Structures are given as C-alpha cells and as structure tokens.
C-alpha cells in the first residue's frame, strides 16, 4: 500500500471528517431558480492504529441525496458503496457534484423603484431558509450601483452597510443570522444627470455566507473502522464530523 506505511500506532484512535460544499445559485428577480448546483468534497483526518479498513456511509441512493457524479482518492476501491485503507493524516476522500433538491440557504428579494431621473429607491430582503436552531455567519450582501451615482443613503436594522464608491456597490455585512428569519436593507441611490437614451443594465445582487450544514443534503451516516490484527475495534474509535457550506456564485438578478 504505497500511501500508508506499516508501523503506525496511536493510543487515541481518533478521526475527523469535513464535508466542504459550495452552493451556486442564479435566480431571477421574481424568484425562479435559473441555475443551481453544489460542489462538494469530503476530507478525512485519521489517526488510527495499524492498517485499518474503513467504510464511509452517507445518505445517497426523510433526509436522502442525489450525486450526479463524484471522484475518489486513489485508496477507494471502486465496486455497492465506499471502502478503503486511508492514508495516515489528512487527505481528500472524495469530490462530488449535485443539482437535484438543493437546500438554498437564502432567498434574496430585490425591489427597485426609479424616482424621477434623480433617485433609485432600493429595498432588499434576505430570508434564511434552514433550521431555527442553526446560524449562518459572514453574511455579505452586495448591491451594485450605477456609474452616475453621486451619493447613497442607507438604513439597516441588522448588520452594518457602507457604500464603496471605488467598487460601485453597497456592501451589507451581517455577523450572524438564524434560520427561518428575514431582514431588510433600504438605500436611496442619488444620481448625476446622465445621457438619457442608454439605460442601466442592472448587475445582480450577490451574497456570501457560511452555514453549518451541507446545502446538498449530505449527511455522514457512519465511518466504520475494522482492523483485524490489532486489539482495538470500531467502538474504540473517537469520531467527529463537521459541515461547512459556503456560497459560490450566489446571485439574484434585479
């Protein structure tokens, strides 16, 4: 076995699994999902005695997901689900892609109202869509502003927002938000006169966030360790999982 040496021992046989996903979304201004998909990878860090054979079980085929495709570390034996002797230390067990039944962590709802030739009233609502007892964090909503913008007012009850002139966007940062909640920002965008004819091609509003679960739906069901020679067994292994779901491209046309 060219990725794992022979004399490995730990008194604490311990393992950690990391389900890392990024959810990509393109949504129309009234809420149709135009494109969506998750790219995931599972990373394992193991400190296990000897040459353990491991079995990774997840909810592939009431919580149950669809992998469109996926690829495996050299140690996974192909033929009917997932088996290996892992390398010692940290390594990437698998990489996968999902499109069906994704949990979109946020809905963005834009409202833009032209007020004469002078102002845009913009309202943006964000809805968290996941368990009440879970918190997203590092939320960033980014609202683009046109080239003739002379100044901007904003009010937001949650988080903090700044207009960044050099970037033609209002950036709204929220430290944390629980599931099943709603929040808004209001902005007035003040405009310089501009050449009347050509009209504003509105870029989409983008978000970033991190959520403590897998937008694809993936749940780790078990990580089985059988080591047939050494006097530790599966119950002796201490096991942890963590889910880190982050936005990729997450855009709502407006």
């Amino acid at each position: 076995i060219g990725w794992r040496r022979e004399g490995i021992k730990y008194r604490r046989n311990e393992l950690f699994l990391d389900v890392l996903e990024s959810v990509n979304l393109l949504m129309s201004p009234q809420g149709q999902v135009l494109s969506a998909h998750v790219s995931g990878r599972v990373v394992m860090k193991s400190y296990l005695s000897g040459m353990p054979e491991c079995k990774f079980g997840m909810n592939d085929k009431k919580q149950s997901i669809a992998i469109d495709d996926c690829t495996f570390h050299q140690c996974v034996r192909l033929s009917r689900s997932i088996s290996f002797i892992p390398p010692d230390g940290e390594f990437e067990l698998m990489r996968y892609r999902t499109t069906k039944d994704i949990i979109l962590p946020f809905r963005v709802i834009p409202l833009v109202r032209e007020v004469g030739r002078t102002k845009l009233e913009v309202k943006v609502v964000i809805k968290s869509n996941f368990k009440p007892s879970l918190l997203a964090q590092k939320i960033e909503v980014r609202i683009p502003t046109p080239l003739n913008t002379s100044g901007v007012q904003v009010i937001c009850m949650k988080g903090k927002a700044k207009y960044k002139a050099s970037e033609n966007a209002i950036v709204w940062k929220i430290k944390r938000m629980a599931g099943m909640k709603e929040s808004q920002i209001s902005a007035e965008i003040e405009l310089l006169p501009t050449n009347d004819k050509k009209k504003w091609a509105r870029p989409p509003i983008s978000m970033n966030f991190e959520v403590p679960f897998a937008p694809s739906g993936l749940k780790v069901r078990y990580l089985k360790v059988f080591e047939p020679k050494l006097n530790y067994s599966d119950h002796d292994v201490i096991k942890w999982v963590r889910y880190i779901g982050r936005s990729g491209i997450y855009e709502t046309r407006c």
């Binding site: 950690f16 780790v220 078990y222 096991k239 942890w240 999982v241 963590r242 880190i244």
Partner: peptide, 10 residues
C-alpha cells in the same frame, strides 16, 4: 468565533 467543528459522530 465559530465553533463547529466538530460534532460527535456515532
């Protein structure tokens, strides 16, 4: 903060 990271796995 975060915290996270890890949860116990049965």
């Amino acid at each position: 903060d975060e915290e996270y990271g890890y949860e116990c796995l049965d």
